[PDB]
Symmetry: C3
Subunit: 183 residues, 3 copies
């Protein structure tokens, strides 16, 4: 029994794709400790998504994993960009899969039907000094079916119409938690 972290590494490329177009830089870290997995994530919109307006359409960024906890090539965030294990003691991304990667996955029996957590997602919070009307929502959906994925994690960005105006799509550090899979 050991902890394990899967992540994008620091300074991720534009690795969030909508219609195969790179539009969002996603820092994603999945850390499994004894029983629970902590999702630690942040996002920076690029190009057409650098600035979001109150009329921005909602969207999902879905990660698809196989039965062994390996990130598949077909999600919005996928294995074509940097993804792998974080060794304790350095900031590298180790791409070679281990059986242990399954421990970062959402427990299939606990999440046998889809689960969700919708939380505030502050945008550009330092520069707008946390103005209430500069937050959207980001909902994590756990194990909503997608393709032939065994596990899915979806980051769904919602309620842009709560924004008072155009806002730089520079998210806060977001945290979610779920029960990890058994080896």
């Amino acid at each position: 029994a050991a902890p394990i972290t899967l992540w994008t590494g620091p300074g991720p490329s534009i690795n969030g794709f909508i219609n195969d177009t790179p539009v969002i830089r996603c820092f994603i870290c999945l850390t499994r400790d004894s029983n629970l997995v902590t999702v630690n994530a942040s996002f920076v919109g690029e190009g057409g998504y650098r600035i979001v307006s109150p009329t921005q359409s909602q969207f999902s960024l879905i990660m698809e994993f196989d039965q062994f906890g390996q990130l598949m090539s077909t999600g919005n965030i996928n294995s074509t960009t940097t993804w792998g294990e974080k060794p304790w003691g350095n900031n590298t991304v180790q791409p070679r899969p281990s059986h242990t990667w399954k421990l970062c996955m959402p427990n299939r029996e606990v999440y046998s039907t889809p689960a969700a957590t919708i939380s505030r997602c502050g945008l550009d919070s330092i520069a707008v000094d946390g103005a209430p009307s500069r937050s959207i929502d980001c909902m994590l959906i756990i194990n909503k079916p997608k393709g032939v994925a065994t596990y899915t994690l979806t980051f769904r960005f919602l309620n842009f119409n709560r924004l008072s105006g155009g806002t730089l799509f520079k998210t806060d550090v977001l945290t979610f938690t779920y029960v990890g899979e058994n080896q």
Copy 2:
């Protein structure tokens, strides 16, 4: 051996209708308390049944209180209690091991840190996938830590509040809720 110290107490998956109000089973409560090195993470979700299947904006607030004794044993007298499934989750499987160990105390909220009651009030989305996170489909859930109840040494209270935020009748199918507190010393 820091790896020797973590412990998880939980209901197991697919809990029964194990949340009681006035001795009537009304809510299915998935509760997981995971102690790692120092902090305990509460991971919880709830599904209303019977008259609590759907909640309206005029719904009265309520507490689901878990009472624990000084050894971290869930007592039989709370709204969520030891008459239903509760015990340790072994690393590597989804069983519930009901035989109390002294290690169970490590999942409790530290008596000195929480020598007077503490709280965290947070958003509690209802039916979030089906309503696509509509802002007016959230209530609040407040975790109260060590508010006295009877002779419990520790208490954890899930208090559901601010149903008047809801735009209408909503399925009482909560998000996965997370809270954190300082764990008790062995």
Copy 3:
């Protein structure tokens, strides 16, 4: 192989949050590093002029400054002039002897090479007011916003007091934040 460590103020902190060299807030701060992430667990109680806060309250930051070894410096709003050190597993003491392990509680400098933030709800007097929606402010954690010669900073910035419906005891909820911990 992971090595957990907790740095904290201990329970019942003194008035250890200073604004303009005046002690105004009792700050309970716990930084707990497990395998990869640090969990910030904190709560605050105002004293004197900050005992009660009103909708007209000006925003403020409580900054913790740490050096390259993860040792709390003397120059932040929360600083090494008050109780701060390691929490031993099994008791509630505060051990002041610095170790190479203290760096593990710091925000990873490569991950947070520019400042990061998390703005979250901060309920005030929540049990007494029964969680009334108009009794919350916000608390934003800012990670590694530059200050002085600190290598790492953690800033608790209290904001949006105008969300309050009136004078409210500045007795915060238990607040939690998470960030990627520094490498040994």
